[PDB]
Design a binder for these strands. Structure first.
Ligand SMILES: [Mg+2]
Ligand SMILES: [Mg+2]
Ligand SMILES: [Mg+2]
Ligand SMILES: [Mg+2]
Ligand SMILES: [Mg+2]
Ligand SMILES: [Mg+2]
Ligand SMILES: [Mg+2]
Ligand SMILES: [Mg+2]
Ligand SMILES: [Mg+2]
Ligand SMILES: [Mg+2]
Ligand SMILES: [Mg+2]
Ligand SMILES: [Mg+2]
Ligand SMILES: [Mg+2]
Ligand SMILES: [Mg+2]
Ligand SMILES: [Mg+2]
Ligand SMILES: [Mg+2]
Ligand SMILES: [Mg+2]
Ligand SMILES: [Mg+2]
Ligand SMILES: [Mg+2]
Ligand SMILES: [Mg+2]
Ligand SMILES: [Mg+2]
Ligand SMILES: [Mg+2]
Ligand SMILES: [Mg+2]
Ligand SMILES: [Mg+2]
Ligand SMILES: [Mg+2]
Ligand SMILES: [Mg+2]
Ligand SMILES: [Mg+2]
Ligand SMILES: [Mg+2]
Ligand SMILES: [Mg+2]
Ligand SMILES: [Mg+2]
Ligand SMILES: [Mg+2]
Ligand SMILES: [Mg+2]
Ligand SMILES: [Mg+2]
Ligand SMILES: [Mg+2]
Ligand SMILES: [Mg+2]
Ligand SMILES: [Mg+2]
Ligand SMILES: [Zn+2]
Lengths: 206, 23, 127, 97, 155, 116, 83, 60
RNA sequence: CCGGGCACUCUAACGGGACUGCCCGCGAAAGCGGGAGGAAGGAGGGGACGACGUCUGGUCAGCAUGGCCCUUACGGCCUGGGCGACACACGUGCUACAAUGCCCACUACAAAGCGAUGCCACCCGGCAACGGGGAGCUAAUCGCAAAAAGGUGGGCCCAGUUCGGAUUGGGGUCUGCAACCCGACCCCAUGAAGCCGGAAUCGCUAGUAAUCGCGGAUCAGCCAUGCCGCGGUGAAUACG
């Protein structure tokens, strides 16, 4: 196991942070802690919706949470219902000006963690893992994508001997920084143990 | 003599002060 | 009236002013030989003027910051060489074969994790 | 009139240091230009793996850049339009006299 | 190394004699990267080899050097099952290096207490044909002579 | 056995010569030279009998030396060893007293290694 | 050791037990868990059982052992030699 | 000896010396950075995610 | 220091600049040798970056997790102790064995960072560790802070020493509820082994090795001689 996390290798180059704000020495820890509880709260609740990214902005005692998701309705609710229903629970823990927006997901198959979560969910349903991956890479490339690679690790199919199976198509230059690549990971819990799913989607080289 | 505390050089090494290296 | 060049070496930087006179030299509010006493390498800071035989034709009010005594010396050697091509652009010859026109980019290499220095690896013994 | 700019991002710091200096130089009168103060860096060294493997580290840093701008000939023609200035999130501002 | 023949470094001439050869001798005296201390001791020696003998140090030094240069040395090469001491000529680059190293090492054998003195005294006896450095040269020279029978093993 | 029970090294500077006495370091040597007004840089082979008898008389009366100092150090340890305190145990097994590691090293308190 | 600017350290809860015995008529065995406590001129004559992590050591206290701690007189390590 | 410890860490001690930082994320008693409240393990995890404002890989 | 000025130096963003581009030569081409110009020339130096896989490598003790196991306990809390033991054995290190040195005094030149029960200028009590005051600074302002090797001078005179600083006695300072086990620091006394290391064995090819100081993380304090960084001075040699 040698490869680097492709997200942190691109911060300030082809990929932008998910918590964008300044803070002095004495507050960074407390503000980040809330950023964890908030993500903790939402990623817990908003899996149903199809959570892609939880952006967070800050000024003074207030925070705008720009939440990307493929099914905006599951977030919105009945007429504007759920969007505020959380905002009260959110600002209950937050205790401050929670500006909870909802952002469109243009193509959910060009969202890496979405593709991952999907596949990870499928293998919790005893689905053909060899097939499942081959399909996801097949669906991603049909969505006009320039490249795709998907990896599944663990007791595939329930076998006592662990196995790491992977599939790829097009180009995926992980050594390039100008190459914009989305990466997402999802954990697939089963009765026989943890399976890990990684997703690599190559959007384009700037 | 970077180990002898009773010297200039010795207190430099320890990063300390005293009679032998005052401030 | 005044002739100037910037001289740098590692962490040292030198602003130097050549103004005609008897041959006086000053570094950082101090006489040259006074700020560089007991250092043999100091005679090399006055080197480029000897490549054009202008030993006493110019005086020099010089300041210097950063680096070390001999680092600062090489910065001085570069700026007084720099200043000559501004005073006399035809002095490019007989100063570049001596390479005085150039600044050596060699600086302290970075300390790496896993080594005690930039390259000094920790000693090991298998069996 | 002492506007001090603190931020993790200089692409937003210099961009906002544009918008600030643009406004008061427009709405009268003098603004002493944007000076790039030295950046304060907090580096962290960490062992790559969770167990042993001491001789393998990764390097992280946090670069709080600093900018400074002045308004030389102030006059409250600016004192309300600056009060209406679209500031990004990755930046903190200070005012003084 | 393996790839190509590496380049020889030319030393920045000394400020007292403008001599590239003198600079080399200086550097071999230099412990711990303390050149200035090495500069004194050698120049101090130039002072001493003037007093105790009224003539040019550069002339004393350079002539002393020539008397320490070995023309033949033996380089080991275990051909077959025995270690053969093959006689080899010495390139001037190495003749210089070996003379200087020995010259300083021979100095540090002497019983006189100050470094300035030893360097002088060895350089004094070296031009006059004596001193440990010349002893080592003659040794290494006879060894290559002794093994003249392995002339055909040379590389 | 001039002062104070030890015959201090001649041809050496009077300040260092005093350090060869049990109970006197460089410190108490710098002291007795002012307190008796004698030149620290002169040799003992150059001391006036006046300078001698004064330095002697002062030092034997101001500080505890040779056998007596050794006596109290012994007496101090003898009691620590006898009361049954930890400081006494370490003096009775000859092990390091000042809380050093004993897994390795400690060679000065024990003596040369006894391999196994 | 402990700075002279501060006070001579006894855990007080033990110092209390000592004085009460001097008044009411000394003396019996004292179970303590204060090795960090200083022996003190009032403690002289008693016998205090000092815990070393495993057992309480019956320690008679005398005049010569005043300035020390209770823990010095209750060994912590078992050692009969090697081999 | 874990959950009773991750909760013992939160409550105030009987003496001030007994205060010790645990990782506010995973509970790691060792290698805790005050500035983040995180251990070097979590620190590297989030920094790679980009969930740490301004924090980026250093190079010189 | 004030006026003044942004020149310079720097600061920190944005650009330029190197492409064997150009001359000679050998070339089928790619390239190679040498020249010029140029700060830099043939990847300019360093970093970041680690293919399919290997090692049934390491990590259930950071976390997650299948499963197997415990239930007035294999859970939990507290006081004390242990993790610091010591006939020994190995790895990695620190400081040395001295005169290219050691000590005292006076005198220079760095970089990177850190700093609101935080760094603490200056002032006074103590030989000192420190202690009382007390100015400034959310720090290109104020402070840690002296850089050290270097430099001018004086001493030591080849001796287990003015080398070396272990071990022990004693008096103290600081943190912290508390320094017996078991902290560091200071002062007086003590002044060990050690005279350059058997078989064997490690690193480094240029601003490198060697040598000198400095900062940070963790952290009440500290057993850091560790680690991660930073500049000063600054080599030898590569036939093959
Ligand atoms: Mg000494
Ligand atoms: Mg001079
Ligand atoms: Mg360095
Ligand atoms: Mg190893
Ligand atoms: Mg290591
Ligand atoms: Mg020889
Ligand atoms: Mg003595
Ligand atoms: Mg200890
Ligand atoms: Mg111990
Ligand atoms: Mg337990
Ligand atoms: Mg748990
Ligand atoms: Mg603690
Ligand atoms: Mg901690
Ligand atoms: Mg300008
Ligand atoms: Mg080439
Ligand atoms: Mg690459
Ligand atoms: Mg295994
Ligand atoms: Mg676990
Ligand atoms: Mg398990
Ligand atoms: Mg314990
Ligand atoms: Mg341990
Ligand atoms: Mg070590
Ligand atoms: Mg060493
Ligand atoms: Mg002795
Ligand atoms: Mg001996
Ligand atoms: Mg001695
Ligand atoms: Mg004591
Ligand atoms: Mg303790
Ligand atoms: Mg000797
Ligand atoms: Mg040596
Ligand atoms: Mg050895
Ligand atoms: Mg190499
Ligand atoms: Mg040294
Ligand atoms: Mg240090
Ligand atoms: Mg610190
Ligand atoms: Mg601390
Ligand atoms: Zn953690």
């Amino acid at each position: 196991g040698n490869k680097i996390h492709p997200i942190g290798f691109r911060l300030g180059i082809t990929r932008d942070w998910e918590s964008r704000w300044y803070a002095g020495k004495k507050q960074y820890r407390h503000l980040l802690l809330e950023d964890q509880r908030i993500r903790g709260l939402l990623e817990k609740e908003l899996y149903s919706a199809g959570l892609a990214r939880v952006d967070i902005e800050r000024a003074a005692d207030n925070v705008a949470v720009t939440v990307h998701v493929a099914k905006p309705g599951v977030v919105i609710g009945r007429g504007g219902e759920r969007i505020r229903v959380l905002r009260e629970e959110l600002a209950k823990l937050t205790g401050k000006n929670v500006a909870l927006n909802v952002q469109e997901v243009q193509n959910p198959n060009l969202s890496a963690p979405l593709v991952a979560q999907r596949v990870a969910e499928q293998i919790e349903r005893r689905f053909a893992v060899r097939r499942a991956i081959k399909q996801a890479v097949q669906r991603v490339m049909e969505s006009g994508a320039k490249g795709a690679k998907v990896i599944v690790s663990g007791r595939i199919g329930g076998a006592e001997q662990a196995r790491t199976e992977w599939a790829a198509q097009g180009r995926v230059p992980l050594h390039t920084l100008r190459a914009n690549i989305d990466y997402g990971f999802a954990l697939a819990r089963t009765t026989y143990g943890v399976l890990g799913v990684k997703a690599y989607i190559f959007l384009g080289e700037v | 003599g970077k180990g002898d505390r009773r010297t200039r050089r010795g207190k430099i090494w320890r990063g300390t002060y005293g009679k032998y290296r005052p401030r | 009236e005044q002739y100037y060049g910037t001289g740098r070496r590692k962490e040292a930087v030198a602003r130097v002013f050549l103004r005609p006179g008897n041959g006086k030299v000053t570094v950082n509010g101090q006489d040259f030989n006074e700020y560089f006493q007991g250092l043999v390498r100091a005679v090399a800071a006055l080197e480029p003027l000897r490549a054009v035989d202008a030993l006493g034709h110019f005086d020099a009010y010089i300041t210097v910051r950063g680096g070390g005594k001999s680092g600062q010396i090489d910065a001085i050697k570069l700026g007084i060489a720099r200043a000559l091509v501004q005073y006399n652009p035809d002095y490019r010859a007989k100063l570049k074969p001596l390479g005085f026109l150039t600044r050596d980019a060699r600086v302290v290499e970075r300390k790496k994790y896993g080594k005690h220095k930039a390259r000094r690896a920790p000693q090991y013994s298998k069996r | 009139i002492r506007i001090k700019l603190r931020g993790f991002d200089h692409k937003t710091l210099d961009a906002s240091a544009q918008k600030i200096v643009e406004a008061a130089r427009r709405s009268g009168a003098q603004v002493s230009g944007p000076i790039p103060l030295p950046t304060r860096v907090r580096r962290f060294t960490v062992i790559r793996g969770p167990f042993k493997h001491k001789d393998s580290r990764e390097h992280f840093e946090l670069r709080t850049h600093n900018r400074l701008v002045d308004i030389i000939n102030p006059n409250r023609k600016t004192i309300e339009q600056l009060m209406t200035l679209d500031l990004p999130t990755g930046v903190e501002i200070e005012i003084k006299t | 190394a393996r790839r190509r023949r590496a380049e020889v470094r030319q030393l920045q001439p000394d400020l007292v004699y403008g001599d590239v050869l003198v600079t080399a001798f200086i550097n071999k005296i230099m412990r711990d990267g303390k050149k200035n201390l090495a500069a004194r001791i050698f120049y101090d020696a130039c002072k001493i080899i003037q007093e105790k003998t009224g003539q040019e140090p550069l002339k004393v030094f350079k002539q002393a050097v020539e008397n320490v240069k070995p023309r033949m040395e033996v380089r080991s090469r275990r051909v077959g099952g025995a270690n053969y001491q093959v006689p080899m000529e010495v390139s001037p680059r190495r003749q210089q290096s070996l003379a200087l190293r020995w010259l300083v090492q021979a100095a540090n054998q002497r019983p006189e207490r100050r470094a300035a003195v030893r360097i002088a005294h060895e350089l004094m006896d070296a031009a006059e044909g004596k001193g440990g450095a010349v002893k080592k040269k003659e040794d290494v020279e006879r060894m290559a002579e002794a093994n003249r029978a392995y002339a055909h093993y040379r590389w | 056995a001039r002062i104070a029970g030890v015959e201090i090294p001649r041809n050496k500077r009077v300040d260092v010569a005093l350090t060869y006495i049990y109970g006197i370091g460089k410190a108490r040597a710098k002291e007795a030279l002012e307190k008796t007004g004698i030149n620290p840089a002169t040799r003992v082979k150059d001391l006036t009998e006046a300078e001698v008898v004064r330095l002697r008389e002062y030092v034997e009366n101001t500080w505890k030396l040779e056998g007596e100092l050794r006596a109290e150090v012994a007496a101090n340890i003898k009691r620590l060893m006898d009361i049954g305190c930890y400081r006494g145990l370490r003096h009775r097994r000859g092990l390091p007293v000042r809380g050093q590691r004993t897994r390795t090293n400690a060679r000065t308190r024990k003596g040369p290694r006894k391999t196994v | 050791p402990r700075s002279l600017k501060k006070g001579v350290f006894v855990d007080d809860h033990l110092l209390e037990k000592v004085l009460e015995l001097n008044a009411k008529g000394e003396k019996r065995l004292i179970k303590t868990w204060s090795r960090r406590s200083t022996i003190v001129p009032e403690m002289v004559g008693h016998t205090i059982a000092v815990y070393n992590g495993k057992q309480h050591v019956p320690v008679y206290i005398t005049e010569n052992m005043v300035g020390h701690k209770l823990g010095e007189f209750a060994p912590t390590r078992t050692y009969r030699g090697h081999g | 000896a874990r959950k009773a410890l991750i909760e013992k860490a939160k409550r105030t001690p009987k003496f001030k010396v007994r205060a010790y930082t645990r990782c506010v994320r995973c509970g790691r008693a060792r290698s805790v950075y005050r500035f983040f409240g995180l251990c070097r393990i979590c620190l590297r995890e989030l920094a790679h995610k980009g969930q740490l404002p301004g924090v980026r890989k250093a190079s010189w």
